[PDB]
Amino acid sequence: MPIASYAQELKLALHQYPNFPSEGILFEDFLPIFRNPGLFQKLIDAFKLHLEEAFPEVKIDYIVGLESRGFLFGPTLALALGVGFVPVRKAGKLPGECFKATYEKEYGSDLFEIQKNAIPAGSNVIIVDDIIATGGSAAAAGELVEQLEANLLEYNFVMELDFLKGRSKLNAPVFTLL
Amino acid sequence: MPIASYAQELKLALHQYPNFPSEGILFEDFLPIFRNPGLFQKLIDAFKLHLEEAFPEVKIDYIVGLESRGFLFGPTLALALGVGFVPVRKAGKLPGECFKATYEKEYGSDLFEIQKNAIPAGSNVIIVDDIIATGGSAAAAGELVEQLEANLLEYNFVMELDFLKGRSKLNAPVFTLL
């Protein structure tokens, strides 16, 4: 059926890569989806249909995409929904005043930013990305949305993979298409 | 003229930032465009209008976008045109067999990749990105398209900025919207 029909076709288009990006990790490459407009259309329609059914009476203001894979489908989904798109980037890339969030890893940390004036306080947003695994960048994006005094309605991911490092807690509902 | 109207309105949405990313460079941020679906669509319509005039009797097979600002509008443009999208990424990120190209800077280098199986030989391609300044990544992307034995029809950029380091030679015509 509908969302499930699209999910099925998209799953079959993924390419499996064992031991990537590290040994033991079974990677799934979604890039083939973008190479074919027929498949790309179904990816966007699947998320659009999901959001229309998940929030029939709640207004979505922005799609927040995570660098860089979330940039591949997030902006198009935003346009398809008639809403704005705002990126979360690795620190040091965005111009202007930015809110910052840190993801502490075993060794070192990952810094993320979002432009302070990009989303008004009270806005409702959906954070999107390709893969949800350890969840570091997703959790960080969540903190940034909170600093903007915006509401995180849900996270939308294309897939879930096991990067062998456990899972960081996400403080919002999660929908994973595949 | 339609494309003139789009360009003028899009230019007004840009935000200036002195000395970014480094001292002496006057940056222009196009991110506000994506925050407004009406403006975002005008950006897409502007590039569509250009390509329809530039390649009336030539089939475009793929839009190749550069990481990561090219990912913000490249996929969207691709789907709007009904063609495929393929990313060029900084080395070490893409899964699968990849072609490699190096951008030699004065005191370092930037390595780029494209998946070998992403584009069939003989395909017609348009490379897109936000800013054309030094042209380093753009030149590397051109070399990658050549390794795929594909035809580079043109480069499409949103804007041109002066990064104070000259501009590398590009082996294909260039179109800059703003």
CSV table of C-alpha atoms in Angstrom, one decimal:
chain,number,residue,atom,x,y,z
A,1,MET,CA,0.0,0.0,0.0
A,2,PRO,CA,0.8,3.8,-0.5
A,3,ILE,CA,3.6,4.8,1.9
A,4,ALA,CA,4.5,1.1,2.2
A,5,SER,CA,4.6,0.8,-1.6
A,6,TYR,CA,7.0,3.6,-2.0
A,7,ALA,CA,9.1,2.3,0.9
A,8,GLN,CA,9.3,-1.1,-0.7
A,9,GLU,CA,10.6,0.2,-4.1
A,10,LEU,CA,13.1,2.5,-2.4
A,11,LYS,CA,14.5,-0.2,-0.2
A,12,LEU,CA,15.2,-2.3,-3.3
A,13,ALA,CA,17.2,0.6,-4.8
A,14,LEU,CA,19.7,0.7,-1.9
A,15,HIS,CA,23.1,-0.7,-2.3
A,16,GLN,CA,24.7,-2.6,0.5
A,17,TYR,CA,28.3,-2.0,1.4
A,18,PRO,CA,29.8,-4.2,4.1
A,19,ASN,CA,32.5,-2.8,6.4
A,20,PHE,CA,31.7,0.9,5.6
A,21,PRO,CA,32.6,3.4,6.8
A,22,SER,CA,34.3,1.1,9.4
A,23,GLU,CA,34.8,-2.6,9.7
A,24,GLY,CA,31.7,-4.5,10.9
A,25,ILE,CA,29.3,-1.8,9.8
A,26,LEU,CA,26.7,-2.9,7.2
A,27,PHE,CA,26.2,0.3,5.2
A,28,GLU,CA,23.2,1.0,2.9
A,29,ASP,CA,23.7,3.7,0.2
A,30,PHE,CA,20.6,5.7,-0.7
A,31,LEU,CA,22.3,7.7,-3.4
A,32,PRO,CA,20.9,5.5,-6.3
A,33,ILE,CA,17.5,6.9,-5.4
A,34,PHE,CA,18.5,10.4,-6.5
A,35,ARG,CA,19.9,9.2,-9.8
A,36,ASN,CA,16.4,8.3,-10.9
A,37,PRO,CA,13.7,10.9,-10.8
A,38,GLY,CA,11.0,8.2,-10.5
A,39,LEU,CA,12.6,7.0,-7.3
A,40,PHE,CA,13.4,10.5,-6.0
A,41,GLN,CA,9.8,11.5,-6.5
A,42,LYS,CA,8.7,8.5,-4.4
A,43,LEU,CA,11.1,9.4,-1.6
A,44,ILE,CA,9.6,12.9,-1.3
A,45,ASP,CA,6.0,11.7,-1.7
A,46,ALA,CA,6.6,9.1,1.1
A,47,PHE,CA,7.8,11.7,3.6
A,48,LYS,CA,5.1,14.1,2.5
A,49,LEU,CA,2.3,11.6,3.0
A,50,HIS,CA,3.8,10.6,6.3
A,51,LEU,CA,3.8,14.1,7.6
A,52,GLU,CA,0.3,14.8,6.3
A,53,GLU,CA,-0.9,11.8,8.3
A,54,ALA,CA,1.2,12.4,11.4
A,55,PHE,CA,0.3,16.1,11.7
A,56,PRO,CA,-3.1,16.7,10.0
A,57,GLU,CA,-4.0,19.5,12.4
A,58,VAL,CA,-0.6,20.8,13.3
A,59,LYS,CA,1.2,23.4,11.2
A,60,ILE,CA,4.8,22.6,10.2
A,61,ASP,CA,6.9,25.7,9.7
A,62,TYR,CA,10.3,24.3,8.7
A,63,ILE,CA,12.2,21.3,7.7
A,64,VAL,CA,15.7,21.3,9.3
A,65,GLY,CA,18.2,19.1,7.4
A,66,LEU,CA,21.5,17.8,8.8
A,67,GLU,CA,24.7,18.3,6.8
A,68,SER,CA,25.2,16.8,4.3
A,69,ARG,CA,22.9,13.9,3.5
A,70,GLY,CA,19.8,15.6,4.9
A,71,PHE,CA,20.5,18.3,2.3
A,72,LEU,CA,19.9,15.8,-0.4
A,73,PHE,CA,16.1,15.5,0.2
A,74,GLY,CA,15.2,18.0,3.0
A,75,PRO,CA,15.0,21.1,0.8
A,76,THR,CA,12.9,19.4,-1.8
A,77,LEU,CA,10.6,18.0,0.9
A,78,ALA,CA,10.2,21.5,2.3
A,79,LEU,CA,9.2,22.9,-1.1
A,80,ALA,CA,6.8,20.0,-1.6
A,81,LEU,CA,5.2,20.8,1.7
A,82,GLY,CA,5.2,24.6,1.0
A,83,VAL,CA,7.4,25.3,4.1
A,84,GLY,CA,10.9,26.7,4.7
A,85,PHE,CA,14.2,24.8,4.9
A,86,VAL,CA,17.0,25.5,7.3
A,87,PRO,CA,20.3,23.6,7.6
A,88,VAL,CA,22.3,22.5,10.6
A,89,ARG,CA,26.0,22.5,9.7
A,90,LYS,CA,29.2,21.4,11.2
A,91,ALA,CA,30.6,24.4,13.2
A,92,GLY,CA,32.5,27.1,11.3
A,93,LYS,CA,30.7,26.9,8.0
A,94,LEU,CA,27.6,29.1,8.5
A,95,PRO,CA,27.8,32.9,8.4
A,96,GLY,CA,26.2,35.2,10.9
A,97,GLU,CA,25.2,34.6,14.5
A,98,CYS,CA,24.7,31.0,15.3
A,99,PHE,CA,23.6,28.8,18.2
A,100,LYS,CA,26.0,26.0,18.9
A,101,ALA,CA,25.7,22.4,20.3
A,102,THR,CA,28.4,19.9,21.2
A,103,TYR,CA,28.4,16.1,20.7
A,104,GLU,CA,31.0,14.5,23.0
A,105,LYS,CA,32.5,11.4,21.5
A,106,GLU,CA,34.8,8.7,22.9
A,107,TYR,CA,37.7,10.7,21.5
A,108,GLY,CA,37.1,14.4,20.9
A,109,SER,CA,33.8,16.1,20.0
A,110,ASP,CA,31.6,17.2,17.1
A,111,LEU,CA,30.4,20.8,17.0
A,112,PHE,CA,27.2,21.9,15.2
A,113,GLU,CA,25.5,25.2,14.4
A,114,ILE,CA,22.3,26.7,13.2
A,115,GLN,CA,21.7,30.4,12.3
A,116,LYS,CA,20.0,32.3,15.1
A,117,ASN,CA,17.6,34.2,13.0
A,118,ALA,CA,16.6,31.4,10.7
A,119,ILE,CA,13.6,30.1,12.7
A,120,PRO,CA,11.3,32.3,14.9
A,121,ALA,CA,10.5,31.2,18.5
A,122,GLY,CA,7.4,29.0,18.6
A,123,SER,CA,7.9,27.5,15.2
A,124,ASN,CA,7.2,23.8,14.6
A,125,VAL,CA,9.9,21.8,12.9
A,126,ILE,CA,10.8,18.4,11.6
A,127,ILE,CA,14.5,17.4,11.6
A,128,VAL,CA,15.5,15.2,8.7
A,129,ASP,CA,18.6,13.1,7.8
A,130,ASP,CA,19.5,10.0,5.9
A,131,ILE,CA,20.8,7.7,8.6
A,132,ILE,CA,20.0,7.3,12.3
A,133,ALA,CA,22.7,5.3,14.0
A,134,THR,CA,24.5,6.6,17.0
A,135,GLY,CA,22.4,9.7,16.9
A,136,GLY,CA,25.0,12.3,17.8
A,137,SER,CA,24.2,14.9,15.1
A,138,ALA,CA,20.5,14.3,15.5
A,139,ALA,CA,20.6,14.9,19.2
A,140,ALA,CA,22.7,18.0,18.7
A,141,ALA,CA,20.3,19.3,16.1
A,142,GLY,CA,17.6,18.8,18.7
A,143,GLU,CA,19.5,21.0,21.2
A,144,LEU,CA,19.9,23.7,18.6
A,145,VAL,CA,16.1,23.6,17.9
A,146,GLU,CA,15.6,24.1,21.6
A,147,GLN,CA,17.9,27.1,21.7
A,148,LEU,CA,15.8,28.6,19.0
A,149,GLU,CA,12.8,28.2,21.3
A,150,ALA,CA,11.2,26.1,18.5
A,151,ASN,CA,9.2,22.9,18.8
A,152,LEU,CA,10.6,19.6,17.5
A,153,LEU,CA,7.6,17.7,16.3
A,154,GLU,CA,9.5,14.7,15.1
A,155,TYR,CA,12.7,13.3,13.4
A,156,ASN,CA,12.3,11.8,10.0
A,157,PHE,CA,15.1,9.5,8.8
A,158,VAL,CA,15.4,7.4,5.6
A,159,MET,CA,17.0,4.5,7.4
A,160,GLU,CA,18.4,3.1,10.7
A,161,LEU,CA,21.9,1.5,10.7
A,162,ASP,CA,24.0,0.0,13.4
A,163,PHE,CA,27.3,1.8,13.7
A,164,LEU,CA,28.3,-0.4,16.7
A,165,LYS,CA,28.4,2.4,19.2
A,166,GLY,CA,25.0,2.3,20.8
A,167,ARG,CA,22.3,5.0,20.6
A,168,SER,CA,22.2,8.5,22.1
A,169,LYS,CA,18.7,9.4,23.5
A,170,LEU,CA,16.5,11.5,21.3
A,171,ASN,CA,13.9,13.6,23.0
A,172,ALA,CA,11.2,13.6,20.2
A,173,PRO,CA,9.2,11.0,18.2
A,174,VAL,CA,11.1,9.2,15.4
A,175,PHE,CA,9.8,8.0,12.0
A,176,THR,CA,12.2,6.0,9.8
A,177,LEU,CA,10.9,5.3,6.3
A,178,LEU,CA,12.8,2.1,5.5
B,1,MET,CA,12.0,39.7,-18.3
B,2,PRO,CA,11.0,36.8,-16.1
B,3,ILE,CA,14.5,35.6,-15.3
B,4,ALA,CA,15.5,39.3,-14.6
B,5,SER,CA,12.6,39.6,-12.1
B,6,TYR,CA,13.6,36.4,-10.3
B,7,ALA,CA,17.3,37.4,-10.1
B,8,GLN,CA,16.6,40.9,-8.7
B,9,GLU,CA,14.3,39.5,-6.0
B,10,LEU,CA,16.8,36.8,-5.1
B,11,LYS,CA,19.6,39.2,-4.9
B,12,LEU,CA,17.7,41.3,-2.3
B,13,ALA,CA,17.4,38.1,-0.1
B,14,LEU,CA,21.1,37.7,0.2
B,15,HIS,CA,22.8,38.8,3.4
B,16,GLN,CA,26.4,40.3,3.4
B,17,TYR,CA,29.1,39.3,5.9
B,18,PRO,CA,32.4,41.1,5.8
B,19,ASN,CA,35.6,39.1,6.3
B,20,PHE,CA,34.0,35.7,6.0
B,21,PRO,CA,35.2,32.9,5.7
B,22,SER,CA,38.5,34.8,6.1
B,23,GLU,CA,39.8,38.4,6.3
B,24,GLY,CA,39.2,40.5,3.2
B,25,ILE,CA,36.5,38.3,1.7
B,26,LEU,CA,33.0,39.9,1.4
B,27,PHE,CA,30.6,37.0,1.7
B,28,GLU,CA,27.0,36.8,0.5
B,29,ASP,CA,24.7,34.3,2.2
B,30,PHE,CA,22.0,32.7,0.1
B,31,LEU,CA,20.5,30.7,2.9
B,32,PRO,CA,17.6,33.1,3.5
B,33,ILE,CA,16.3,32.0,0.1
B,34,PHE,CA,15.6,28.5,1.3
B,35,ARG,CA,13.7,29.8,4.4
B,36,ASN,CA,10.9,31.1,2.1
B,37,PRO,CA,9.3,28.5,-0.2
B,38,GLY,CA,8.1,31.3,-2.6
B,39,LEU,CA,11.7,32.6,-3.0
B,40,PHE,CA,13.2,29.1,-3.1
B,41,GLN,CA,10.8,28.2,-6.0
B,42,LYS,CA,11.9,31.4,-7.8
B,43,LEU,CA,15.6,30.2,-7.6
B,44,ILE,CA,14.6,26.9,-9.2
B,45,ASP,CA,12.5,28.6,-11.9
B,46,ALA,CA,15.4,30.9,-12.7
B,47,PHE,CA,17.8,28.0,-13.3
B,48,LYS,CA,15.1,26.2,-15.3
B,49,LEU,CA,14.5,29.2,-17.5
B,50,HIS,CA,18.2,29.4,-18.2
B,51,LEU,CA,18.6,25.8,-19.1
B,52,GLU,CA,15.5,25.8,-21.3
B,53,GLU,CA,17.1,28.6,-23.3
B,54,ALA,CA,20.6,27.3,-23.2
B,55,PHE,CA,19.9,23.7,-24.2
B,56,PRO,CA,16.6,23.6,-26.2
B,57,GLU,CA,17.7,20.7,-28.4
B,58,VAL,CA,20.0,19.0,-25.9
B,59,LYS,CA,18.9,16.4,-23.4
B,60,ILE,CA,20.2,16.9,-19.9
B,61,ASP,CA,20.7,13.6,-18.1
B,62,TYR,CA,22.1,14.7,-14.7
B,63,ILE,CA,22.7,17.6,-12.4
B,64,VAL,CA,26.0,17.1,-10.5
B,65,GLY,CA,26.1,19.1,-7.3
B,66,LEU,CA,29.1,20.0,-5.2
B,67,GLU,CA,29.2,19.3,-1.5
B,68,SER,CA,27.6,20.8,0.3
B,69,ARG,CA,26.0,24.1,-0.8
B,70,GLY,CA,25.3,22.6,-4.2
B,71,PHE,CA,23.3,19.9,-2.4
B,72,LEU,CA,20.9,22.6,-1.2
B,73,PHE,CA,19.4,23.3,-4.6
B,74,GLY,CA,20.9,20.9,-7.0
B,75,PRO,CA,18.7,17.9,-6.2
B,76,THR,CA,15.6,20.1,-6.2
B,77,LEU,CA,16.5,21.5,-9.6
B,78,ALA,CA,17.2,18.0,-10.9
B,79,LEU,CA,13.8,16.7,-9.8
B,80,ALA,CA,12.1,19.8,-11.2
B,81,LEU,CA,13.7,19.1,-14.6
B,82,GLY,CA,12.9,15.4,-14.4
B,83,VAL,CA,16.5,14.4,-14.5
B,84,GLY,CA,18.9,12.5,-12.1
B,85,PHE,CA,21.1,14.0,-9.4
B,86,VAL,CA,24.6,12.9,-8.5
B,87,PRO,CA,26.8,14.4,-5.7
B,88,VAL,CA,30.5,15.1,-5.8
B,89,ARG,CA,31.9,14.8,-2.3
B,90,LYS,CA,35.0,15.5,-0.4
B,91,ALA,CA,37.1,12.3,-0.4
B,92,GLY,CA,36.4,9.5,2.1
B,93,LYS,CA,32.7,10.1,2.4
B,94,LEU,CA,31.2,8.2,-0.6
B,95,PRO,CA,30.7,4.4,-0.5
B,96,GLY,CA,31.6,2.2,-3.5
B,97,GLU,CA,34.1,2.6,-6.2
B,98,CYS,CA,34.9,6.2,-6.9
B,99,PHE,CA,36.9,8.3,-9.3
B,100,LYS,CA,39.2,10.9,-7.6
B,101,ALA,CA,40.3,14.4,-8.5
B,102,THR,CA,42.6,16.7,-6.7
B,103,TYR,CA,42.4,20.5,-6.3
B,104,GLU,CA,46.0,21.7,-5.7
B,105,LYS,CA,46.0,24.8,-3.5
B,106,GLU,CA,49.0,27.0,-2.7
B,107,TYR,CA,49.9,25.2,0.5
B,108,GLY,CA,47.7,22.1,0.5
B,109,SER,CA,45.1,20.1,-1.5
B,110,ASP,CA,41.4,19.1,-1.5
B,111,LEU,CA,40.6,15.7,-2.8
B,112,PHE,CA,37.1,15.0,-4.4
B,113,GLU,CA,35.2,11.9,-5.5
B,114,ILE,CA,32.3,10.8,-7.6
B,115,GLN,CA,30.8,7.3,-7.7
B,116,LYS,CA,32.0,5.4,-10.8
B,117,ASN,CA,28.6,3.7,-11.5
B,118,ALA,CA,26.5,6.9,-10.9
B,119,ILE,CA,26.6,8.2,-14.5
B,120,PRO,CA,26.7,6.2,-17.8
B,121,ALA,CA,29.3,7.2,-20.4
B,122,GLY,CA,27.9,9.7,-22.9
B,123,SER,CA,25.5,11.3,-20.4
B,124,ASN,CA,25.0,15.1,-20.6
B,125,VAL,CA,25.7,16.9,-17.3
B,126,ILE,CA,25.4,20.3,-15.6
B,127,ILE,CA,27.6,20.9,-12.6
B,128,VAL,CA,26.0,23.2,-10.0
B,129,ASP,CA,27.1,25.0,-6.8
B,130,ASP,CA,26.3,28.1,-4.8
B,131,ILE,CA,29.5,30.2,-5.2
B,132,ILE,CA,32.1,30.3,-7.9
B,133,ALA,CA,35.3,32.0,-6.5
B,134,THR,CA,38.6,30.2,-6.9
B,135,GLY,CA,36.9,27.4,-8.8
B,136,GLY,CA,39.0,24.7,-7.2
B,137,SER,CA,36.2,22.3,-6.4
B,138,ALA,CA,34.5,23.1,-9.7
B,139,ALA,CA,37.6,22.3,-11.7
B,140,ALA,CA,38.0,19.0,-9.8
B,141,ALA,CA,34.3,18.1,-10.5
B,142,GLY,CA,35.0,18.7,-14.2
B,143,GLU,CA,37.8,16.2,-14.1
B,144,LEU,CA,35.5,13.7,-12.4
B,145,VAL,CA,32.9,14.1,-15.1
B,146,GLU,CA,35.6,13.5,-17.7
B,147,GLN,CA,36.7,10.2,-16.0
B,148,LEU,CA,33.0,9.1,-16.3
B,149,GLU,CA,33.4,9.8,-20.0
B,150,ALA,CA,30.4,12.1,-19.6
B,151,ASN,CA,29.8,15.4,-21.4
B,152,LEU,CA,30.0,18.5,-19.3
B,153,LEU,CA,27.5,21.0,-20.8
B,154,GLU,CA,28.0,23.9,-18.5
B,155,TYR,CA,28.5,25.1,-14.9
B,156,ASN,CA,25.6,26.8,-13.2
B,157,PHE,CA,26.3,28.9,-10.1
B,158,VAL,CA,24.1,31.1,-7.9
B,159,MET,CA,26.8,33.8,-7.4
B,160,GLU,CA,30.4,34.8,-8.0
B,161,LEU,CA,32.6,35.9,-5.0
B,162,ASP,CA,36.2,37.1,-4.8
B,163,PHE,CA,38.2,34.9,-2.5
B,164,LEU,CA,41.4,36.8,-3.4
B,165,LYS,CA,43.2,33.7,-4.9
B,166,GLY,CA,42.3,34.1,-8.6
B,167,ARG,CA,40.2,31.6,-10.5
B,168,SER,CA,41.2,28.2,-11.9
B,169,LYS,CA,40.4,27.5,-15.6
B,170,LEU,CA,37.1,25.7,-16.3
B,171,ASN,CA,36.8,23.6,-19.5
B,172,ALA,CA,33.1,24.4,-20.0
B,173,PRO,CA,30.9,27.5,-20.2
B,174,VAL,CA,29.8,29.2,-17.0
B,175,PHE,CA,26.5,30.7,-16.1
B,176,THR,CA,26.1,32.7,-12.8
B,177,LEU,CA,22.5,33.7,-11.9
B,178,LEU,CA,23.3,36.6,-9.6
